[PDB]
């Protein structure tokens, strides 16, 4: 399994955490509902936009995801720092 | 490039998140004031 | 156009009073209400003059009002 931590800000994070820091379930990257977005998995293959897993494809502060809450487009995830 | 498209998408995410925050703030103001 | 097809996300008209008749505060003014909807901060949202706008997925276009006792109110924009 991929390590469930980040050594920096999560550029290489490839784990399976799929909830945001507030506990919201992540929207699947291959879904455009409830939030339409441009992070198309087949368009950014090296970013590993798999299932609804938190990812940091874009030099965000840490891995994040779109959320299934219509009133919350996206949120950071709580990925621990590696020790 | 793909890197520049991702940076554009990130900036758009940040803009939309601030507008979400400001809207919630407007409604919280109304509830506190009432 | 002076109407909205949905909730006014694309409204760019010149209605400048709220649903209650209060004249809107200019977006580039911080008086009487200080606020964070700075036009240069949101250049693509068309926050011009004191026109009703919906930059933030509100139910309708809205504005801050010139009444110091009423921070903001929705506007009454006709439906197309």
Swiss-Prot record, chain A:
It comes from Homo sapiens (Human). Disulfide bonds join 5-82, 26-65, 54-77. Residues 4-82 form the Kringle domain. This is Angiostatin. The gene is PLG.
Curated annotation (Swiss-Prot), chain B:
Residues 3-28 are annotated as: 2 X approximate tandem repeats, type a. It is found in: Secreted, Cell wall. Changing residue 23 to A: 2-fold decrease in plasminogen binding. It comes from the Bacteria. Changing residue 10 to A: 50-fold decrease in plasminogen binding. Residues 1-25 are annotated as: Able to bind plasminogen. Binds to human plasminogen (and plasmin) via its kringle repeats. Also binds to albumin, immunoglobulin G and fibrinogen. Could provide the bacteria with a mechanism for invasion, as streptococcal-bound plasmin could permit tissue penetration. PAM has more than one binding site for plasminogen; it is thought that each of the a-repeats can bind one plasminogen molecule. Belongs to the M protein family. This is Plasminogen-binding group A streptococcal M-like protein PAM. It comes from Streptococcus pyogenes. The lineage of its organism: Bacteria, Bacillati, Bacillota, Bacilli, Lactobacillales. The gene is pam. The chain holds residues 89 to 122 of 388 of the full protein.
Curated annotation (Swiss-Prot), chain C:
Residues 2-80 form the Kringle domain. Disulfide bonds join 3-80, 24-63, 52-75. This is Angiostatin. It comes from Homo sapiens.
């Amino acid at each position: 399994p991929a390590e469930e931590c980040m050594h920096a800000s999560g550029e290489n994070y490839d784990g399976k955490i799929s909830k945001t820091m507030s506990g919201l379930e992540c929207q699947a990257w291959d879904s455009q509902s409830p939030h339409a977005h441009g992070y198309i998995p087949s368009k950014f293959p090296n970013k590993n936009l798999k299932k609804n897993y938190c990812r940091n494809p874009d030099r965000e502060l840490r891995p994040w995801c779109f959320t299934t809450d219509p009133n919350k487009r996206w949120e950071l995830c709580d990925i621990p720092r590696c020790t | 490039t793909a890197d520049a498209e991702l940076q554009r998408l990130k900036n758009e995410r940040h803009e939309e998140a601030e507008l979400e925050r400001l809207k919630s703030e407007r409604h919280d103001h109304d509830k506190k004031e009432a």
